[PDB]
């Protein structure tokens, strides 16, 4: 039947589609499928979203866009050597571009109040640089990451979206009109109104 | 389809005792490039034919596809299977990455106490959960897989740490694994890296 996903009736970005629906939402949307949404108040870490088609219940967004993309057309490629470098730059924004971006962000949206923060900043930030140099080194002048756009697109671009808040894709040309060319898409475009849309309701 | 090549540094627990021991488990023999000084510059490369490979769990994941035992075969399950692969690598390793930084690498920083209390808080909490998962499981979701390699191997980066003895069900996990046979085929081999150079 009909997937059914979670997010939460308010959401701390403040409908700005910064949490980890937005992918899952884009990806479905990208896809065409119809999908049904729960509210949710306070998955083996209680997080959102939660992803359930029957009796199958998925949880962590990689492996949930991960599902959406094979089981229907547009996310990924057919041939299984693009398929397995897809799947690579899939892992690679979650586990080595988004902790980056993560520990920097931590530091410069929450922790004004902590002694040394001046000094941390500037370590966590000189980590980030250097992953968004090799990003872009990769990027140079194509379109997307690897051909197609492609589920790993998705990730990539929500995991750099967080970068928004502080500014710094600003020195980074292609990887700011990359985020663009992915936020021009009518499924993006799709999936942040209806994440706005939960925003207003609540 | 020509037998893989994998790429290590002469220097180390490293990214590549996941990819060896799914190689292991899986029985497919491989060849290992050395290299001293992949868009992000890690260890392992996978080569096999004209596919080259970064991210070890992709590497993992694509040895775990066209082989057998590491992936199950229902479609439920596999993306069951899928999920924990993601959370070893995204959700438990970053809050181990950010403790064990502390606890190693950044001693003579006058803010250690108060940091290091902090990211241990943030692990704690995440061990938590997975032991609450786990409970008396053998692994976390059915047979052995793909997901408990790269858990195991997340895991054992808090060996040198201690913090594992509090939570007796995952330090029985990490032994369970290290006592398959292809574990130690996988540990030896990384082992005979070590002692070349």
């Known amino acids: 039947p009909n997937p059914t996903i979670t997010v939460f009736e308010r959401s ?14 884009w990806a479905l949307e ?19 979203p939660s992803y359930e088609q029957g009796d199958l219940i998925l949880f962590e967004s990689g492996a949930i866009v991960m599902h959406i993309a ?13 398929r397995a470098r897809t799947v690579a730059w899939m892992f690679a924004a ?6 980056s971006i993560l520990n920097f962000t931590t530091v410069w949206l929450f ?15 000189e980590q980030l640089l250097k992953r968004l140099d090799e990003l872009s080194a990769w990027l140079g002048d194509r379109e997307w990451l690897e051909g197609s756009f492609s589920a790993a697109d998705i990730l990539m671009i929500c995991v750099l979206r967080r970068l928004e808040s502080s500014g710094i894709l600003k020195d980074y040309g292609n ?8 936020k021009a898409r009518p499924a993006f475009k ?10 207003t309701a609540a």
């Open 175 to 182: 990887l700011l009109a990359y985020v663009e060319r992915g």
């Open 30 to 48: 990208e896809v065409g499928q119809p999908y049904h949404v729960r509210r949710l108040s306070f998955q083996p870490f209680g997080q959102i």
């Open 190 to 199: 799709r999936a942040f109104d209806a994440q706005l849309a939960v925003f």
């Open 111 to 125: 922790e004004r109040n902590e002694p040394w923060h001046e000094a941390r900043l500037a370590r966590t930030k």
């Open 94 to 99: 979650l586990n080595t571009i988004e902790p």
């Open 70 to 82: 094979q089981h229907h057309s547009g996310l990924l490629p057919e041939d299984q050597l693009r």
């Open 12 to 25: 701390p970005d403040g409908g700005r589609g910064l949490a980890r629906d937005m992918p899952v939402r």
